[PDB]
Amino acid sequence: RLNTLSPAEGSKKAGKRLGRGIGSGLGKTGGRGHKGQKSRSGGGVRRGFEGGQMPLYRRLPKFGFTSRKAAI
RNA sequence: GGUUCUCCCCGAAAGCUAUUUAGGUAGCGCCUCGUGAAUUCAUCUCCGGGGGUAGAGCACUGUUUCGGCAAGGGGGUCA
């Protein structure tokens, strides 16, 4: 019977493979569009980057303090 | 610059804001899939609205041509 067990429907998806033909859908850059920083290998912006504008976590003021008694 | 098998369904944008930013990027707008909702939404009819655009006009702010009345101004009679 070892060649009769099957998984539940919807348990597997087979993943996404990029750049494998036209009919496969996401080929020819595999869904990352045309030129640009995001299209490059290893490209992208770090967390909180807004394109040069002051990030939200920098526009706002830090407040409060940590209490050691709260951890005990 | 290149990115390799197939079929089915839906289907954009080239805008705004910010950026040592302008051929990059972030949020929003636009696309897709899922979930939940109210005759929610669109077209038409009727009703209630506020505009100052087209047009027009010259009361006002400016500009413009002609004619009249013409304060006033010059020369001339004077006491």
From Swiss-Prot:
One function term, GO molecular function aspect: rRNA binding
Sorted UniProt keywords: Ribonucleoprotein, Ribosomal protein, RNA-binding, rRNA-binding
One GO term (biological process): cytoplasmic translation
TM helices/strands, residue ranges: none
Region (Disordered): 1-53
GO cellular component: cytoplasm; cytosolic large ribosomal subunit
Ranges annotated as biased composition (Gly residues): 20-30
Similarity annotation: Belongs to the universal ribosomal protein uL15 family.
Summary of subunit composition and partner proteins: Part of the 50S ribosomal subunit. Contacts the 5S rRNA.
Function description: This protein binds the 5S rRNA. It is required for the late stages of subunit assembly, and is essential for 5S rRNA assembly onto the ribosome.
UniProt name for this protein: Large ribosomal subunit protein uL15
Taxonomy of the source species: Bacteria, Pseudomonadati, Pseudomonadota, Gammaproteobacteria, Enterobacterales
Encoding gene (name): rplO
Residues of the full protein shown: 2 to 73 of 144
